[PDB]
Design a protein around this ligand. Structure first.
Ligand SMILES: [Mn+2]
Ligand SMILES: [Mn+2]
Lengths: 459, 91, 32, 27
């Protein structure tokens, strides 16, 4: 019978395993199984070579086979437990080890390994008990939208969790011509959906503009919708044929600012691919307080609305890159020329911007004429002339940078050795400039900033 | 504690008059020295984050400060009670 | 007839003792 | 849970520091 050579094969293979000749052990073990498909011992010792070589997939397999093949192979359960510990299968390891020890009390024991299993599972159970830190109950838990309490005092259409109809959005723009506001359940429901989409968008936005396609780019709005009312009506409504990019600064000041983000966040749901919103540099709780936006919210709504707006706002991106050739930022240049695109993808959102590092280079850098580099203040470490940008633009293959921090006479300027440009949406921004405004027009075939001149001055 | 119970007092100023908390550790103590060793073994072990928070709430309570929500606290206790009481149903 | 329970005729004291803030001096908030 | 204070908060915390020591395996 074939057992005569299976004995030699298993013997030679155990001797190869002891001699660290693992391939030869596995081959002669396989051959011993080829002569006896059902000896549980062969699958047992074969699984031990698969512990030793970390060939764990067949440690698990052949340990299971050894035990299925003989339910009374006690030392098979023991070797399965050895596989389980190597691999973290702790409950199975306890049960296998318990059985073995009660059957075989010893001094060079299975029981030190059982006590290691005991000590490990004891601490892991304690850790499962003291564990909070799955702690993220939602701002809107108990689903405040489905509490009904609908009013329609505004005669407002129902706005579903599906994309807000353009017809209402046109009506909403009319509700701003008429100083009229959304109902609360719809407003909560859009803020929930806005969170859900925005929190998944990349922290640096990447878009390819085809040669035949043109983008209109927008800057600081100071929370006045009148200017965007007009550009949407003037340059085409922000539909798929008007893939606008907005350089933030909406809660920059409060005047219609709730109403501004409330419409922008409406349009963002209907055309998310075409309509792109960045965070502005005057935008944190610190300024939401100073310019009374927090008060507008607390006047129009109970304070939990401000917690939801905080959550929603915290997901805004800082930057966008067009074709890998034009980079849109708020403030200006990075503290060093070595800043690398995947390292920008590794910037951590769900925090306030710092006064140092890439996030307040992006928001509070502030480009100069003169060559070099500034020192830490103003939400910052550094601000710049041309020289670092020559070397930065060479890393990433960029042409020039877009900024929105500073007012300029025609609504824009091309500056910084010709390697940077200005834009913003509000004409007569402040006590500080009575500027005209403009929108940059960019073609995939021609990225030299082209402009729309905006003289429609509110106030 | 006294201020929060004054029936007719204006509490809008509580954000100004409440003091900031300092935490003091006893370095000569067993739990603290073993916490040093485990925190040194791996800084980001969520178990250290769990243990530090459980120690903080206990200290807070015994120091005389109300817990922000006592149900979170009681639930941690009810989980540790199960572990010692011999519930084989972990669920 | 019985020693019957008395829902006690309670009193509500709403007296006040004034509290005052040791606020920052002008010097402190201006230069420190 | 019910809003009562403890008559002495130290005995309560000691019961906690014992469970913590057993859970960690300190003693
Ligand atoms: Mn701004
Ligand atoms: Mn600015």
């Amino acid at each position: 019978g074939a057992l005569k050579r299976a004995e030699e094969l298993k013997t030679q293979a155990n001797d190869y395993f002891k001699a660290k000749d693992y391939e030869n052990a596995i081959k002669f073990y396989s051959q011993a199984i080829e002569l006896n498909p059902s000896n549980a011992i062969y699958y047992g010792n074969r699984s031990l070579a698969y512990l030793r070589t970390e060939c764990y997939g067949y440690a698990l397999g052949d340990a299971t086979r050894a035990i299925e093949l003989d339910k009374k192979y006690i030392k098979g359960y023991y070797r399965r437990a050895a596989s389980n510990m190597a691999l973290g299968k702790f409950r199975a390891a306890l049960r296998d080890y318990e059985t073995v020890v009660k059957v075989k009390p010893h001094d060079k024991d299975a029981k030190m390994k059982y006590q290691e299993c005991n000590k490990i599972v004891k601490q892991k159970a304690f850790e499962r008990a003291i564990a909070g830190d799955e702690h993220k109950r939602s701002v809107v838990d108990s689903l405040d939208i489905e509490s009904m309490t609908i009013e329609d005092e505004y005669s407002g259409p129902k706005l579903e969790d599906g994309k807000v109809t353009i017809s209402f959005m046109k009506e909403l723009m009319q509700w701003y011509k008429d100083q009229k506001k959304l109902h609360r359940k719809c407003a909560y429901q859009i803020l929930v959906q806005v969170k859900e989409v925005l929190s998944k968008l990349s922290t640096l936005v990447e878009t390819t503009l085809k040669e035949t396609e043109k983008i209109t780019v927008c800057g600081d709005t100071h929370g006045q919708f009148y200017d965007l009312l007009n550009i949407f009506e003037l340059n085409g409504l922000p539909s798929e044929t008007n893939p606008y990019i907005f350089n933030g600064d909406f809660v920059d000041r409060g005047s219609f600012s709730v109403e501004v983000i409330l419409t922008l966040f409406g349009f963002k749901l209907l055309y998310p691919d075409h309509f792109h919103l960045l965070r502005g540099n005057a935008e944190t709780d610190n300024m939401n307080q100073i310019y009374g936006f927090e008060g507008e919210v607390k006047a129009k709504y109970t304070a939990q609305m401000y917690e939801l707006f905080s959550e929603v706002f915290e997901w805004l991106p800082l930057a966008q890159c067009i074709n890998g050739k034009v980079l849109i930022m708020h403030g200006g240049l990075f503290s060093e020329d070595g800043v690398t695109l995947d390292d920008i993808r590794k910037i951590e959102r769900n925090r306030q911007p710092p006064d140092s590092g890439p996030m307040c280079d992006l928001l509070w850098s502030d480009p100069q004429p003169q060559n070099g580099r500034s020192i830490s203040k103003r939400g910052v470490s550094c601000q710049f002339g041309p020289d670092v940008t020559k070397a930065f633009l060479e890393e990433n293959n960029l042409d020039y940078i877009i900024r929105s921090h500073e007012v300029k006479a025609e609504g824009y300027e091309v500056a910084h050795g010709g390697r940077c440009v200005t834009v913003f949406s509000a004409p007569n921004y402040c006590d500080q400039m009575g500027n005209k405004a403009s929108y940059i027009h960019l073609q995939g075939s021609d990225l030299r900033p082209q402009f729309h001149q905006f003289t429609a001055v509110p106030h | 504690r006294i201020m929060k119970a004054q029936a007719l007092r204006d509490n809008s100023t509580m954000g100004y008059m409440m003091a900031k908390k300092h935490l003091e550790i006893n370095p000569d103590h067993p739990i603290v020295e073993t916490l040093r060793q485990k925190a040194e073994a791996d800084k980001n072990d969520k178990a250290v984050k769990d243990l530090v928070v459980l120690l903080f709430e206990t200290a807070l309570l015994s120091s005389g400060f109300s817990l922000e929500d006592p149900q979170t606290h009681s639930n941690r206790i009810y989980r540790m009670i199960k572990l010692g009481l011999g519930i084989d149903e972990d669920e | 007839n019985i020693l019957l329970f008395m829902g006690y005729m309670t009193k509500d004291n709403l007296a006040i003792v004034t509290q005052w803030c040791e606020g920052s001096s002008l010097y402190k908030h201006l230069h420190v």
